[PDB]
Amino acid sequence: FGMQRMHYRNGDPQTPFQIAEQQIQNFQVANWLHFVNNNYFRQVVIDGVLNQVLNDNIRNGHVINQLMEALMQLSRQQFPTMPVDYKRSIQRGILLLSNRLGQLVDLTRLLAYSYETLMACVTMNMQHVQTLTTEKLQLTSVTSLCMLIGNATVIPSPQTLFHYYNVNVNFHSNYNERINDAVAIITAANRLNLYQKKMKAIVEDFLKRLHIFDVAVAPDDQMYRLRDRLRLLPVEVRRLDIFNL
Amino acid sequence: MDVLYSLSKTLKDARDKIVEGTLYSNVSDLIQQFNQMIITMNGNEFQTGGIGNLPIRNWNFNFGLLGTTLLNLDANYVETARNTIDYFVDFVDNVCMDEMVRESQRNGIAPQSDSLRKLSAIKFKRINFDNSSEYIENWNLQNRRQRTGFTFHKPNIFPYSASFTLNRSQPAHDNLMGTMWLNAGSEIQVAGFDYSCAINAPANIQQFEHIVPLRRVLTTATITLLPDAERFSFPRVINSADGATTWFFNPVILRPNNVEVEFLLNGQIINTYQARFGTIVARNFDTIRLSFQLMRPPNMTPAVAVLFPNAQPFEHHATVGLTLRIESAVCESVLADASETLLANVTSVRQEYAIPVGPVFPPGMNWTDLITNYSPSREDNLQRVFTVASIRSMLIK
Amino acid sequence: MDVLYSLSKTLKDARDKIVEGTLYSNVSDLIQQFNQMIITMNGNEFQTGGIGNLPIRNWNFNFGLLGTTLLNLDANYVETARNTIDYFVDFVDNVCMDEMVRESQRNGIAPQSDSLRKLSAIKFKRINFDNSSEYIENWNLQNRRQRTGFTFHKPNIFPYSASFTLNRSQPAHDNLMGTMWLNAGSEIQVAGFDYSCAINAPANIQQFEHIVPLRRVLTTATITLLPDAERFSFPRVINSADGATTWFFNPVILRPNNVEVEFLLNGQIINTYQARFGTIVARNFDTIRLSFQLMRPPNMTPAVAVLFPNAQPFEHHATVGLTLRIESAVCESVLADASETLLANVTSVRQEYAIPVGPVFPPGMNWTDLITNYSPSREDNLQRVFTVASIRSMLIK
Amino acid sequence: MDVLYSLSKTLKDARDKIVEGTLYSNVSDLIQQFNQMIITMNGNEFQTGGIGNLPIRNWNFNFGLLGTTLLNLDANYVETARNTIDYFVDFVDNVCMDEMVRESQRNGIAPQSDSLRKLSAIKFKRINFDNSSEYIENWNLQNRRQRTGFTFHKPNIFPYSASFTLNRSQPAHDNLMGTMWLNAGSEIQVAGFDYSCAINAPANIQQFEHIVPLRRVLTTATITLLPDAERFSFPRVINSADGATTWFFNPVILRPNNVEVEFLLNGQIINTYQARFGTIVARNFDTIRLSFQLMRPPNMTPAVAVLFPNAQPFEHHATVGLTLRIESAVCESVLADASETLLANVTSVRQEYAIPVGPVFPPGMNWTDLITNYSPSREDNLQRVFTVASIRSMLIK
Amino acid sequence: MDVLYSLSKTLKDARDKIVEGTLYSNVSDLIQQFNQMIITMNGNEFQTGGIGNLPIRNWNFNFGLLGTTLLNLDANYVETARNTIDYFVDFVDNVCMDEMVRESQRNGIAPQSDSLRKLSAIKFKRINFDNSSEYIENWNLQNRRQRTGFTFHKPNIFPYSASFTLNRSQPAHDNLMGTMWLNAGSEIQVAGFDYSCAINAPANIQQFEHIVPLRRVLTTATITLLPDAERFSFPRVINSADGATTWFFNPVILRPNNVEVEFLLNGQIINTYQARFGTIVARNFDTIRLSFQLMRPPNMTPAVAVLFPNAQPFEHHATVGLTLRIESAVCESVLADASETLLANVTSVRQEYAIPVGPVFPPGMNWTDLITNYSPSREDNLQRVFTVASIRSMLIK
Numbered sequence A: 001f002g003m004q005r006m007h008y009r010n011g012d013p014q015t016p017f018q019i020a021e022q023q024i025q026n027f028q029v030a031n032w033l034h035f036v037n038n039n040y041f042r043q044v045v046i047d048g049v050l051n052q053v054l055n056d057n058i059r060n061g062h063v064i065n066q067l068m069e070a071l072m073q074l075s076r077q078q079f080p081t082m083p084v085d086y087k088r089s090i091q092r093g094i095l096l097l098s099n100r101l102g103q104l105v106d107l108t109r110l111l112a113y114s115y116e117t118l119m120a121c122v123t124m125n126m127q128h129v130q131t132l133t134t135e136k137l138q139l140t141s142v143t144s145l146c147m148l149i150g151n152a153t154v155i156p157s158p159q160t161l162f163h164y165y166n167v168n169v170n171f172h173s174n175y176n177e178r179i180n181d182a183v184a185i186i187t188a189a190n191r192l193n194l195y196q197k198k199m200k201a202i203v204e205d206f207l208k209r210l211h212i213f214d215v216a217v218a219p220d221d222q223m224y225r226l227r228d229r230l231r232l233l234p235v236e237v238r239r240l241d242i243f244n245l
Numbered sequence B, C, D, E: 001m002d003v004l005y006s007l008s009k010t011l012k013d014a015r016d017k018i019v020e021g022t023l024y025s026n027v028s029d030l031i032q033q034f035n036q037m038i039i040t041m042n043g044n045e046f047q048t049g050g051i052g053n054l055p056i057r058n059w060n061f062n063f064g065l066l067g068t069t070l071l072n073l074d075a076n077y078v079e080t081a082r083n084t085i086d087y088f089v090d091f092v093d094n095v096c097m098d099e100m101v102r103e104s105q106r107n108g109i110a111p112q113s114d115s116l117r118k119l120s121a122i123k124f125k126r127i128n129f130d131n132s133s134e135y136i137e138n139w140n141l142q143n144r145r146q147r148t149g150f151t152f153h154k155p156n157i158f159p160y161s162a163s164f165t166l167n168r169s170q171p172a173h174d175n176l177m178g179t180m181w182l183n184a185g186s187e188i189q190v191a192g193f194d195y196s197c198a199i200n201a202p203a204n205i206q207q208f209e210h211i212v213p214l215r216r217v218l219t220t221a222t223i224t225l226l227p228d229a230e231r232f233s234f235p236r237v238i239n240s241a242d243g244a245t246t247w248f249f250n251p252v253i254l255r256p257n258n259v260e261v262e263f264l265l266n267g268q269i270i271n272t273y274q275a276r277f278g279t280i281v282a283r284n285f286d287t288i289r290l291s292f293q294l295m296r297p298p299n300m301t302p303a304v305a306v307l308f309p310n311a312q313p314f315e316h317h318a319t320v321g322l323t324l325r326i327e328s329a330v331c332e333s334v335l336a337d338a339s340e341t342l343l344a345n346v347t348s349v350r351q352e353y354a355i356p357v358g359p360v361f362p363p364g365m366n367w368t369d370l371i372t373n374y375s376p377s378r379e380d381n382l383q384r385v386f387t388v389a390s391i392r393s394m395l396i397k
């Protein structure tokens, strides 16, 4: 569009696309940028479980049409002052993805459907946090997916869905039962006045029996936070009644 | 008719919903319907007019489908859509007018214009959309031979009738007993007068009755009843019944005695109200019977005693009355009311394009004559033209 | 304006469609539109009020969207949505009031409030939804410079005016001739009186005419015409033209003969009705001419003869009359009528918040003065405030 | 109409810029526009004329694009260009005349000639160019329903009216009080006269008022006010109001005192000027109220005293006059004025081709009648024909 | 000022050239100018108003450049351009009004409003475009010290002044000799009168002189000089010099004798015309000297001889006169005139927003007072406000 390159300042509350959306006067590109900027997960509670839901436009794959409108506009854009061969390469690369409109709509709605179907089998709340360590995603791999996705619909098999659901349910129930064991033991120790009792041992056993944690690595402040939060939970009824006996 | 309504509905929704900036999800279904309409109409040719001064216009349809690949509609999309919508609205308006300006004694409910005849074909049934409007709903019900109902605010149900009946009379018109009345639109104002003030009447009571039959059965009607005919309570000079002479009416208003309003259906009393004024309800009826009495007051102060002597020279004339107004009602057949503009639309189109008087409707669509002789063929033609008028008003403000 | 209407309609549809238990397929597109509204409005600061007693309020937006994969909406969904709906309803209420309380001698159609000026930006166009209401439809059509129309039941087209014109008179006011009239809202009651009862008039006929020029061109109007001015049928004591004294009017009502009503447009007779009472139609007119007569009865019974002498002392004064009511009509300019509450809403907001009288409207939105001097600038401002009033009424009871 | 204006603009630019010797950089964009016009107009068949004596003309376009291979245009290039420019100018001229000689009561603003109707199509939108002239700019603003403004030098806002009003009179016409005026074009000239010189008037002051209601609202008007009416300051013989006889007026001119000039809008005084002559400004008005007084001079030398006796035989008649001239103003609608030639052009075309009297404009484009009854339909048609005349005046000398 | 004019010119060219369908080659350079304007104005905040009733408004600029590539502009491009154009037009309107309603005794030329003071910064110089209009041309020329020039039609150079001088007088005013003139706008009307018709004057000649200075030097002025003063050729009753009494003037017009009109610059006769009427040219002058003579006709017919006696009683008073109108002229300083609306615009804005009387201009921008005491500071402020008014009128109707 002939605009001067953006001098983006890190830590800006707005993202580069959020700036470009209000700095660009072309309707196709600006509308695509607006959708991208305000495209986030929507939180919904379904059957008592928090879910991260997608925008219906991407669930049905319609936003790919706006993406291709923007890409076509860019492809027929003038690109002032850019060397001509590089400009042609860029705009033919744009057309490479633009001419895959139907395939990319199919890819988007396939991805959305498989995400929905596999998310129906999640039992714990899908809490969204920025993790310490991130999974690396290769834009080359994304390109390969976009340029090689075909015409065959692949969906989870019913046995695969039931297996995923059983694994999630087993992990969730084990988590709750180990919480109950830890809370019962901690409460019993405090009620019997075992002052020479290290609740760090109980928390270590809890994390160990969760089976996904390398307990030797958990930081110390987090171990003590876990102890503090376990000390505050009410005891389960059966365990408490046995303790009362 | 249903196809014409669907064209109007689709165009109206196109104008209302295909607006710059709106999400395509708001108009996805509307665009599907619009493209279906374009596909169905493309390649067909129509002719409208040729009657009176209505110009003969030829219509051809070759339009591209509206785009479907867009997240939010923009200026180009709306301009492209409006270019097609304007032509379609013009065509629908001409079809509606050409249908309204035509009538037939037999088969009056069938399409009369060549364009609507053509749209009656099966190839066009794909454009049907949703028949939600009241008039199209009743059109479909009448086509299926079901019960229909139109809701009217002040239905124009009473043929205009301003008259009087003299039960006691003489050439001099100085000792008269009788009734006056005006029935117009939804108001019946009736008065009963006695010049003697029932001096010689049995029990000093004069009975008055007034029967108003309606050409259609009204149901679920709310009526205001008041105890005075305000229109017949001032001095009047009235032409005699045969027009030979004129007589004088100097009323003095007394309260109506033993008021009774009966709403009857096929001669059976359905509702009866005695000495109740204000808002009343008639659930089902085709005739109204208002009965009241002039009772000479038994006790009178000197002024009233002076007013009412017991001898011939009656200078004041005792008068009682009732005023009845149908504020709202429901009727199976289409009537004219004080809130809808369908009668006005039909009459205006006919007058503007100077349509020669046909065989069904009266000259100038005179509603008085229409309701006075609301025969079944007139009912069919009137329902057709009113439905077309509503379809047109859907698009033309 | 379209954006404000879209905000209000989105909130109305949120209140209606989004209910516990409903299928998500019933409300998916509305949920998308609601989320689009939230996205567009988030991060914008608005200010409302600051004129008269209308409080200054600051509006900030940071809300969360709504889920889009449920099967049936539950109580949690509605509870989460209702908070945002309440805040946005309050915002739209205040924006509409701020726009209604403002005028402009020039650029009457343009937004006048700061909030609406901000909403007129292009980033907000993504909230446009659909413009279905009559007022928003006419707003869009007028902006595009297309034929428009508002439908009014009993349009408030005649500024209040009760007066009398004397064509024969003298200081004693004992032998008069002329007309009385009341024009009010949608009704014209005119009476023509002659004290001599056309004793010496040529052919014993006295002609009366009454011309009412409307301030706006009404079209497709249905009228009711009755042969009596009941408002001028009783004895009166009336101040003279200059207020110097009073005169006595003692009417005796005769029928008006040779009644003819002409509805004219720019001096050309569009409709003309001769001796036709009841429901009539006028398709296009800006002037109503009434022409009636008082014919002295050629034959009289003794009472009538006694009350109509040929010498000077005229105890009873012959009177004829016409009552003409416009039940419904169509106007390209916005008017007040008996069914809509837009004038009431604008007046109520201005009165409640003690808005200073501006350079356009009369104080207190006095309809008599406004319709008397209904200039183009006033038409623009009135249409703007009425459109805002209807937008607000979509949400506020 | 924007397309017709763009055709005229590009042809004018070609005539004024495609000159022998001019660099090609001075006509690069113009040649691109000209070739765009040729491409768009190639293969389209138009027809003009048929009304009155305007000949029927058929127009075909099969031209070749102008060359672009010359550094400086030479004689051959200019001749080749002129060959096609002449034909295009002739087509535009005939389209403009055919559009000027037509009118329509309904939708008078819409194109009336077949050629302009066809040019209104979408395919011709490519020939749009720049809309910089005042009339086309106002046309576009009015279509968008934005502000419109025309600046007039001596606007012809007052219909011709030369008359007099007598407030005191008798058959002998020897003791008259009243006011005589001439409103014409942009000048009001009024004079209040009294034959008795306020000998018996209260406080020896006689009041005179003159209200001139304009048919359109003027703004930012520069006006000149002068304290005498030269037109009513010489002896004359005037016909009576009824024309039965003639009466003698022998003015002696005094200074008007308590001069007040009110420029009112909707009956509200917008500007007021008391005892101030020369250049004044009226920012927004639609009525002019001129109030002045004849004050009997309290002190008079014998020569003055002899003029005004206290008895009947008044030989000299005291007169006081005002003269108001609108030098410049701004109006939203179109008016004839002293500098513009549009009214002359339209009238000239109609007279030359003997266009029969249509249903909108008065015969012979009589401006007095047009501005006397300047109805909205006449305003639309007049704006249309004036815009077309301006478009034609940039091609035809 | 130059930057403000550049903004206005850019916006006007954007509104006139950026239209749907136009070739992008027709607007390439204009679009580059538009983008330069947006880039320069982005990130700057402005405030206007705060004087009188002009509302305080704050302006921010965050608009993006126009960069879409196409051959012909479409609806999307026009809409995106129009949003920014609307906002900038509003900003320019308010800045122009804020500058127009302000004054300064010292440094009148310099910007007064804070918005214009900011725009006078160097960082805004990147929006200059072309300064073509007459007023901005003269502004730049004055800044460069080159000679300016404003061409006026009927310049308003004479302050209104109606007066008389009595060179010979008596308390009875029976026998008067003197002059009587009205200078207003562009017209001088002078008349010498002698009641004795120069019976005893030397050579039977009376000489009258009239010297009219000008507050500014006019150049290349075309003037019409006619031999009679219409205004002073009628019977008059005129209050005396001290206002104590009134005297009678009963003129009989004779041809002015030995007419000599001289246009002088610094007391040196620059132009002179003796006994020549019609159109004359004064190339450069600051005062006008009109000399004329009343010569007693050496030969008289009996009627004339009776008209002019040698005794005292003088019933008819010999009068000669001249009229001189400046049709067009050129001045180095700004002036009002009959063809421009700048004075009207400034006065209208000040009146509308109730701007308190400032230290420079007289109350209500009274042109008579302005041109009477046309001080250097007043000239500076007047030129500033007139230039701003021209810039504003480039965008506002």
Ligand SMILES: [Zn+2]
Binding pocket: D153, D338, E153, E338
């Ligand atoms: Zn002039």
